[PDB]
Amino acid sequence: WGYGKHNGPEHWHKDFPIAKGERQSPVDIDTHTAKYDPSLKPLSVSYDQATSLRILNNGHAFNVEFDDSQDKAVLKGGPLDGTYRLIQSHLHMGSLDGQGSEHTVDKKKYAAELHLVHWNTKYGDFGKAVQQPDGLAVLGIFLKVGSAKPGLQKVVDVLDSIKTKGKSADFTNFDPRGLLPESLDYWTYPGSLTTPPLLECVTWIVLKEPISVSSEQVLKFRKLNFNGEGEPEELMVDNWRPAQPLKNRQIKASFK
Numbered sequence: 001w002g003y004g005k006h007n008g009p010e011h012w013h014k015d016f017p018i019a020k021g022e023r024q025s026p027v028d029i030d031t032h033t034a035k036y037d038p039s040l041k042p043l044s045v046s047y048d049q050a051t052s053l054r055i056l057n058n059g060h061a062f063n064v065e066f067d068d069s070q071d072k073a074v075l076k077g078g079p080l081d082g083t084y085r086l087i088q089s090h091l092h093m094g095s096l097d098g099q100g101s102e103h104t105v106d107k108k109k110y111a112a113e114l115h116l117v118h119w120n121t122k123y124g125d126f127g128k129a130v131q132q133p134d135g136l137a138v139l140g141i142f143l144k145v146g147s148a149k150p151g152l153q154k155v156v157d158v159l160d161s162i163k164t165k166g167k168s169a170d171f172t173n174f175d176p177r178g179l180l181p182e183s184l185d186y187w188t189y190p191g192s193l194t195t196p197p198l199l200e201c202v203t204w205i206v207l208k209e210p211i212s213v214s215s216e217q218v219l220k221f222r223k224l225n226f227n228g229e230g231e232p233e234e235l236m237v238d239n240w241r242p243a244q245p246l247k248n249r250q251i252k253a254s255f256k
């Protein structure tokens with residue numbers, strides 16, 4: 001599966017029928033219908049002890065793996081019940097500044113969207129968590145082109161080391177705190193993974209405020225390859241799934 005004409009989003013349902021499920025992601029966040037929820041508790045992002053291990057190219061998107069052997073970096077509060085441990089992060093990138101994000105806000109697309117994946121520790125490990133409706137908590141962060149982002153420059157400098165699929169590079173200083181916007185205002189709704197297996201095990205927390213990255217940083221990420229070494233080049237761009245049917249789910253806002 002991929003994002004091509006012959007293996008893209010419109011084809012996924014054949015191997016993964018849940019693609020046509022009731023709580024699929026991403027979705028368009030319609031601010032005219034999204035509703036403020038006073039029952040939501042304050043969002044708690046504890047990343048001060050976060051510990052990244054490596055960056056990888058799995059042929060689908062730029063990825064970061066984190067040490068989830070302990071509660072070093074966790075997400076709590078908001079719509080969440082319990083503790084969710086950070087395990088990985090990946091980047092969905094567009095081929096043009098006007099596109100790239102999976103979620104949209106009033107149909108508006110951002111240049112890219114970062115996902116920070118966490119699993120509910122009541123389940124023992126990621127593998128078991130992904131099989132439960134409340135197994136994962138994914139924080140979505142929109143990226144727009146503008147001022148460069150320092151917390152991303154160190155990664156951008158070594159992207160050439162993971163240009164093709166199957167490549168990985170040790171990276172112990174990827175601090176997720178440096179990818180967060182100033183405000184933690186967010187929208188939340190029950191959804192799924194946006195790539196096969198497309199399991200509907202995700203509580204989505206999409207931040208309202210995008211972060212800025214420079215055109216140069218964006219360009220570097222767009223130079224990654226979908227293909228493996230020695231294969232015809234296929235730039236890793238537009239690796240995003242379009243908005244899916246809301247199916248009457250309720251999108252809640254953390255702000256009035």
Ligand SMILES: [Zn+2]
Nearest residue numbers: 090092115194
């Ligand atoms: Zn994702």
